[PDB]
């Protein structure tokens, strides 16, 4: 199974933002996919693509005092235009007031 990135750290949590940090120690993945959603909501997930050079990302436009679930996936181009995603690295956090 294609591995999850490692060591998701959520920091700088404000009323409307949070910083995500992760590691890809082998620098295997060509890009990452970040998916985040209000924990209580269904079918309202936001999906961001980020270049494989990155190890951090600032979530913005979040609602205050709200719990979010976030997952980060590595994306690997296995053949032609077929992309495989590995296992998720996930966290749950709540924004401030």
Short mmCIF file of C-alpha atoms in Angstrom, two decimals:
data_model
loop_
_atom_site.label_atom_id
_atom_site.label_comp_id
_atom_site.label_asym_id
_atom_site.label_seq_id
_atom_site.Cartn_x
_atom_site.Cartn_y
_atom_site.Cartn_z
CA UNK A 1 0.00 0.00 0.00
CA UNK A 2 1.38 3.40 -1.02
CA UNK A 3 2.40 5.11 2.23
CA UNK A 4 0.86 8.04 3.98
CA UNK A 5 3.02 11.13 4.46
CA UNK A 6 4.36 11.40 8.00
CA UNK A 7 4.03 13.65 11.05
CA UNK A 8 1.04 15.90 10.37
CA UNK A 9 1.35 18.92 12.68
CA UNK A 10 -1.48 21.43 13.06
CA UNK A 11 -0.31 24.81 14.38
CA UNK A 12 -1.06 28.56 14.24
CA UNK A 13 -4.77 27.83 14.72
CA UNK A 14 -6.74 31.08 14.67
CA UNK A 15 -10.43 31.95 14.36
CA UNK A 16 -10.32 31.34 10.60
CA UNK A 17 -7.08 29.56 9.68
CA UNK A 18 -4.66 26.81 10.60
CA UNK A 19 -1.23 25.76 9.42
CA UNK A 20 -0.62 22.18 8.29
CA UNK A 21 2.88 20.69 8.16
CA UNK A 22 3.85 17.20 7.02
CA UNK A 23 6.92 15.18 6.00
CA UNK A 24 7.59 12.98 2.90
CA UNK A 25 11.00 11.73 3.96
CA UNK A 26 11.87 9.96 0.69
CA UNK A 27 10.46 12.81 -1.45
CA UNK A 28 8.54 10.15 -3.34
CA UNK A 29 5.28 11.95 -4.20
CA UNK A 30 5.03 14.36 -7.10
CA UNK A 31 2.13 16.28 -5.51
CA UNK A 32 -0.19 16.20 -2.50
CA UNK A 33 -3.94 16.38 -2.16
CA UNK A 34 -5.39 18.12 0.91
CA UNK A 35 -9.05 17.47 1.71
CA UNK A 36 -10.79 19.21 4.58
CA UNK A 37 -14.35 19.41 5.80
CA UNK A 38 -16.38 20.50 8.79
CA UNK A 39 -16.50 17.36 10.92
CA UNK A 40 -20.28 17.63 11.34
CA UNK A 41 -21.01 18.15 7.62
CA UNK A 42 -21.54 15.57 4.89
CA UNK A 43 -20.64 16.02 1.24
CA UNK A 44 -19.12 19.51 1.69
CA UNK A 45 -15.42 18.67 1.44
CA UNK A 46 -12.90 21.09 -0.06
CA UNK A 47 -10.04 19.58 -2.09
CA UNK A 48 -6.74 21.40 -2.76
CA UNK A 49 -3.83 20.23 -4.91
CA UNK A 50 -0.34 21.23 -3.84
CA UNK A 51 3.02 20.74 -5.54
CA UNK A 52 5.29 17.96 -4.32
CA UNK A 53 7.92 20.51 -3.31
CA UNK A 54 5.69 21.71 -0.43
CA UNK A 55 5.61 20.43 3.17
CA UNK A 56 3.14 22.91 4.62
CA UNK A 57 -0.06 24.70 3.76
CA UNK A 58 -2.18 27.40 5.41
CA UNK A 59 -5.89 26.62 5.56
CA UNK A 60 -7.88 29.86 5.37
CA UNK A 61 -11.49 31.00 5.23
CA UNK A 62 -12.44 28.60 8.02
CA UNK A 63 -15.46 29.19 10.27
CA UNK A 64 -14.75 30.20 13.90
CA UNK A 65 -15.25 27.78 16.77
CA UNK A 66 -15.73 24.94 14.27
CA UNK A 67 -14.29 21.43 14.21
CA UNK A 68 -12.61 20.31 10.96
CA UNK A 69 -11.23 17.04 9.69
CA UNK A 70 -8.25 17.26 7.32
CA UNK A 71 -6.50 14.56 5.33
CA UNK A 72 -3.36 14.78 3.24
CA UNK A 73 -2.63 12.23 0.50
CA UNK A 74 0.41 11.75 -1.70
CA UNK A 75 -0.28 11.51 -5.45
CA UNK A 76 1.91 9.34 -7.74
CA UNK A 77 1.73 9.14 -11.55
CA UNK A 78 1.93 5.38 -12.05
CA UNK A 79 1.37 5.15 -15.81
CA UNK A 80 0.38 7.54 -18.62
CA UNK A 81 -2.29 9.79 -17.06
CA UNK A 82 -3.28 7.33 -14.29
CA UNK A 83 -2.68 8.77 -10.81
CA UNK A 84 -2.57 6.72 -7.61
CA UNK A 85 -3.16 8.18 -4.17
CA UNK A 86 -1.53 6.65 -1.10
CA UNK A 87 -2.91 6.31 2.40
CA UNK A 88 -4.16 9.42 4.19
CA UNK A 89 -2.50 11.32 6.96
CA UNK A 90 -5.31 12.92 9.00
CA UNK A 91 -6.10 15.19 11.92
CA UNK A 92 -9.07 16.83 13.62
CA UNK A 93 -8.84 20.36 15.06
CA UNK A 94 -11.16 23.18 16.14
CA UNK A 95 -10.74 26.83 15.17
CA UNK A 96 -10.62 29.63 17.73
CA UNK A 97 -12.98 32.49 18.44
#
